[PDB]
Amino acid sequence: SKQTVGGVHVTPEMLESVQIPLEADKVGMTPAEKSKLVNAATAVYIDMAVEEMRSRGLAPKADYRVHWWKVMQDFVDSGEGQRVLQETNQELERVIAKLGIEGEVIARMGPEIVNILTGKTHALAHIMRDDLLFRVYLSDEGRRANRYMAEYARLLTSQRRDIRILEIGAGTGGTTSEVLNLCSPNGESFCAEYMYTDLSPGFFNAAKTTLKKWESHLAFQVLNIEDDPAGQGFKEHTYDLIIAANVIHATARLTNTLSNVHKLLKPGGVFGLVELTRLTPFYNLTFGSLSGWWAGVDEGRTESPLQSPQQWNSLLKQTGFSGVDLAAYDLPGPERHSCLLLSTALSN
């Protein structure tokens, strides 16, 4: 329309239309094609692990990993495995070689499923080796939604001055990097404040190094979004934009988390929520081995920590937001799996 969010004009078609370079290009694949293949290559390893666990009479360690095992089991036993497979199986390594970072994750994690389940491999240590975990955030499978966020942050900050931005779970700054590269392509100081936050300060040095072009304009402060932001030295209701890319789901109680996001935003401020729209085999492989994926189990998020856009919409309205004002999806069709959701913080 002439739809605005945070006072600037933006539409789903505006963001979703954007074309960006993907590793998939260099192999001549469409993003939907690659995503298909990524999850098909993943399905092979899932199927192999399920059959191996069953053949050897193995059971997982009795912790959150059983939830990972269950999803894998359901994926195979529901015939979903077969379906994904039938759209093949020792161009597998040749396929994987062309799947870039996702292929690397698959190559690293796929053969280790049984080891992780049975406690012979520390999943987090394993996937963090060579900063692979950090690089998966830069992968094709999640870069379009991050670019949507960047594009919206560019729209906002280019059209409005002295915008205050906070990023939750910035991590090693993959989203941050997409944002800065778009909003400040050569150091251009573009907002009143970019507050770079994470649960642990251990990221910050690496972040400062990776983002040295914007060193000064970034502030760095620890923020555990599951706890009250005020107690952690943040000024409530001072932010115009909060960016949270695939972090909000990794919390125990979404309404509590969202309530805390609300505390930081001024009335009318925008919440940029970048989230997976649905569980895919690749995401279960990659993140399901990690304890944080199962943070929502106690409140019924047991297949994964994820919520649909419709669920986020309702949760947002319940926690003082407008709901989803705008959804921009990474892809159309069956392969769609991630999105930008924009929401407005409401005064109450």
Side-chain angles (χ1 to χ4, degrees):
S1 172
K2 334 326 158 187
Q3 156 181 48
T4 72
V5 180
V8 308
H9 174 56
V10 59
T11 65
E13 297 76 24
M14 184 174 319
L15 303 173
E16 293 179 341
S17 76
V18 181
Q19 289 172 4
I20 62 173
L22 310 169
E23 288 188 329
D25 301 335
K26 318 213 170 164
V27 187
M29 287 178 295
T30 74
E33 191 179 0
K34 174 173 183 177
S35 188
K36 234 208 293 176
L37 284 186
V38 162
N39 287 285
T42 296
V44 173
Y45 282 105
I46 304 311
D47 184 69
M48 286 193 291
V50 173
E51 188 167 336
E52 173 167 2
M53 290 291 287
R54 285 166 168 175
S55 299
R56 296 178 55 192
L58 303 176
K61 299 308 294 179
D63 59 19
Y64 62 82
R65 275 171 284 209
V66 165
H67 296 308
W68 194 38
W69 170 233
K70 290 264 177 163
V71 173
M72 290 187 167
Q73 276 178 271
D74 286 336
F75 175 77
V76 170
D77 297 347
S78 71
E80 182 65 14
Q82 176 238 359
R83 232 133 32 197
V84 175
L85 293 170
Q86 294 338 145
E87 331 180 44
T88 91
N89 175 63
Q90 275 242 344
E91 334 173 10
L92 167 61
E93 102 200 341
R94 165 163 334 102
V95 170
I96 283 176
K98 284 324 207 339
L99 287 181
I101 295 168
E102 293 90 337
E104 186 167 2
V105 169
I106 292 169
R108 183 173 302 178
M109 303 314 294
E112 287 303 312
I113 295 169
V114 173
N115 278 345
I116 292 168
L117 287 172
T118 56
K120 287 187 168 301
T121 293
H122 191 273
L124 183 55
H126 200 64
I127 196 170
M128 282 184 66
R129 247 200 319 120
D130 306 320
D131 295 325
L132 180 51
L133 176 62
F134 299 151
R135 297 215 320 288
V136 83
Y137 282 83
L138 306 174
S139 74
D140 294 346
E141 200 71 349
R143 197 161 336 114
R144 289 192 56 78
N146 277 309
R147 164 55 67 97
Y148 296 165
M149 179 74 261
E151 292 288 344
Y152 176 75
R154 191 197 74 71
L155 299 186
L156 183 58
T157 53
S158 75
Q159 299 183 42
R160 296 207 56 213
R161 230 131 300 180
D162 301 326
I163 286 292
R164 295 184 52 166
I165 308 176
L166 183 150
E167 178 170 4
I168 307 169
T172 61
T175 301
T176 325
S177 178
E178 290 282 344
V179 170
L180 297 172
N181 290 337
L182 222 55
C183 297
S184 158
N186 309 287
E188 296 90 344
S189 154
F190 65 103
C191 55
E193 180 193 1
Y194 198 112
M195 177 54 74
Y196 188 111
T197 69
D198 206 293
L199 178 59
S200 53
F203 293 103
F204 297 168
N205 290 337
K208 283 164 172 209
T209 302
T210 288
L211 312 165
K212 112 179 57 192
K213 337 180 202 181
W214 309 278
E215 158 135 60
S216 34
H217 309 340
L218 300 169
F220 293 84
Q221 185 168 338
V222 157
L223 170 60
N224 181 0
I225 194 55
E226 302 197 70
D227 298 323
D228 176 74
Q232 310 176 51
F234 295 90
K235 310 178 169 101
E236 294 185 325
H237 305 302
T238 51
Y239 292 91
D240 307 297
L241 176 60
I242 285 185
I243 301 176
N246 283 298
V247 48
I248 299 303
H249 68 248
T251 61
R253 301 185 296 130
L254 295 187
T255 60
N256 170 69
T257 299
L258 290 177
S259 294
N260 287 335
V261 173
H262 190 266
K263 290 184 189 296
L264 285 163
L265 283 162
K266 63 179 65 170
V270 178
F271 184 27
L273 179 62
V274 169
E275 278 287 333
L276 303 181
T277 61
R278 71 186 174 91
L279 189 61
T280 70
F282 176 73
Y283 284 110
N284 183 53
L285 172 59
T286 304
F287 297 103
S289 54
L290 311 178
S291 64
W293 198 245
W294 309 102
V297 162
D298 289 359
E299 66 173 7
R301 292 181 285 122
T302 61
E303 191 194 45
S304 83
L306 306 178
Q307 299 281 275
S308 74
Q310 291 70 26
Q311 281 172 314
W312 288 116
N313 179 59
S314 310
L315 293 168
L316 289 162
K317 292 176 189 296
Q318 293 172 36
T319 55
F321 300 87
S322 59
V324 174
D325 294 344
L326 180 157
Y329 298 96
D330 58 341
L331 308 174
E335 298 308 317
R336 163 185 296 179
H337 57 265
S338 61
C339 67
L340 168 61
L341 308 177
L342 300 171
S343 191
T344 306
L346 304 182
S347 166
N348 57 37

